[PDB]
Amino acid sequence: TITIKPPKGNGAPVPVETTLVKKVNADGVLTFDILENKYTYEVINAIGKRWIVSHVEGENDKKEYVITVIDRKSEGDRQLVECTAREIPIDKLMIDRIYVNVTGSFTVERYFNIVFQGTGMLFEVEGKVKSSKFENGGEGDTRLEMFKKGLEHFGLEYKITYDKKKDRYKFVLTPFANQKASYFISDEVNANAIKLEEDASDFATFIRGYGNYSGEETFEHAGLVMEARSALAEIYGDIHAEPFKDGKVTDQETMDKELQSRLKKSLKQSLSLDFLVLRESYPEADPQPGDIVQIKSTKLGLNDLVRIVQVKTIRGINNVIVKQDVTLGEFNREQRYMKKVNTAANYVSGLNDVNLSNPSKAAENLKSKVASIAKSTLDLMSRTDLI
Amino acid sequence: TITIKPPKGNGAPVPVETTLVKKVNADGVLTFDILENKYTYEVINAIGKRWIVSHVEGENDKKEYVITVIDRKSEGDRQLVECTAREIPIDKLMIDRIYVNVTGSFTVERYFNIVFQGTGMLFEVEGKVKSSKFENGGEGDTRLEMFKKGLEHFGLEYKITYDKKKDRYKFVLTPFANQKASYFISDEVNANAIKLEEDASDFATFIRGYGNYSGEETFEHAGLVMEARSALAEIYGDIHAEPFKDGKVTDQETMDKELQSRLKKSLKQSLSLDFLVLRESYPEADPQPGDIVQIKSTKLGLNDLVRIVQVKTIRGINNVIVKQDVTLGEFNREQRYMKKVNTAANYVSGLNDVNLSNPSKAAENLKSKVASIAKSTLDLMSRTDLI
């Protein structure tokens, strides 16, 4: 069912229920639970991590993943192995770092070519995309998170694919990655439980933006002062979000696009419905992330079309699906909170200045040092202007 | 059963089920739940916090702890008192601070003697240990967290003991604190549920390190550029962790030890098994943290020996044990996450610059001020080189 091989050489299949999860740009991940048996013994007693799993979904979808977590429990006179795994087109990026500090202006192809140095994978952009400047390179950082920053600046979304060729993974970078899908949904036919959530606690009608003042000014608001607003503003009225304070961008064409993007990203709609697969009927609905879909729930006020952003498959044996879960538009309110928490908890404990007993000594020492050197610089300025 | 006394004078016993927890270096803690009775009335209605608890484990283990939390619930025509407590060889450290900012080079005995000033407790190192330099003292900080930093630099582990003498607590500082233990374990005899967890999401085969460049350079990689790797690398291959960027260490002998320590700390194995005490048989297995133990689970592929890192006792009455829980090697995956979260949540809210509505004003103001003073300094440099 599931062909797993060491990092050197031959394969071996095992039957086990799988739980895969795929997002548009975020890392995909799977999980499963092997158990000891008369079969599987030679494997289960001999798996070391970074075992290479593949041939999920049968004799197709040869998307090769790698295990990183390994649990081993004892049940009766046998033993379980829960385990986790991640993509090679993502892990292979988490392999390598870059030490040369990228800095300055950077066109997109140059940037996403220097980071694909030695990995072997390939990138390509579809539409014309502008260029910007990256302040400090991640000398002690992965290729992955610099890929994150690059997507945040230039290519707002992406999609990988195992091309026909061996050891190749084309990264189609694109804003708002999508493909049409023939299938569809409705409350009656494929949508058991439709949770429509409309979160708006950080939302906006008009908004201000400042983005060409030099690095040393910070508020003497030169640099394309403007405020924009969306169409819905006129009935809701005067509100506004955190203005686009940070910016070294010259033109005004940018200052409206980024600004309206700051607006329309905030009136959030997460549809964490549930999907239930029909095999004997409607088989042509294998959900895949980053596709278009036309949902329609009667008695809800809903017929529009949306895009998948999260999908969650399970597959017991023979790669037959049991159920699906999906989320549309924004991935969740939930997962946004959880990522916020985990980012806080990992950014912290990666630092070293933290001292829980009276913190801010490390920050206040720094800030007072800064103001003191500024005072000394003032003295130097006066003393030099004297001469 | 449990002799508790005010901070001034006489004792009073109470019977109550206790839940103790002991780690190697981390603070131990206990918890228990007294209830109103015809007995215990004079006490329970008259406990104030920092009541001094002792004589746990009977007429032995006179490890005197102190209460800091006090809950009081109403059950029927009676009342409960849940409560928590902590060690005096740790709380007595959380008592006192140091205001003189320790700074500069520091030999270990000097450092761990200036911090034991007025506490009365005693420290000693067993093996020869090098010395380093501490950048800023914790003028507004506990003796405890400076003890933490000191252990992080020089003495990578420790172990306290109530010596025979009164009001004395010897801190045997040591790397990898351990003592042999005659007892042992196996799946059949003492290990009900063996959860072996092998976490590797931040792991390494080779690794780079930079540690003698001066404070003002930050990447012009002078200072013992090197990359090392472990023995298992050759089959897993090219990966690497966050390089040892931060460092003011001259020699190369250090740069391999610390580096391989960064490696081998990361392929993590947490064995959060469960222990069940046999009283009529096998009584000589009172588990204590920071000891060696030889586990062996058949049908698992396991006969090696490990060390305890966490233990969790309970004792109903007459100081008879009911069950034990323990964790081996690294204390958990779980508790690492939870400590990460709580460190984030307490480091935050100890600060004052935080403003949830558009943060980064406090950081960007600072950074732009820094670049502006650097620009002014450039002007001064040019204007002085003129003269």
Partner: peptide, 20 residues
């Protein structure tokens, strides 16, 4: 009392592969 551990354990599981 028994319950906090299961949720926190699944949370730490989720901390694996949550980030690009």
């Amino acid at each position: 009392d028994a319950l906090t551990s299961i949720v926190n354990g699944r949370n730490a599981k989720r901390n694996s592969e949550y980030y690009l």
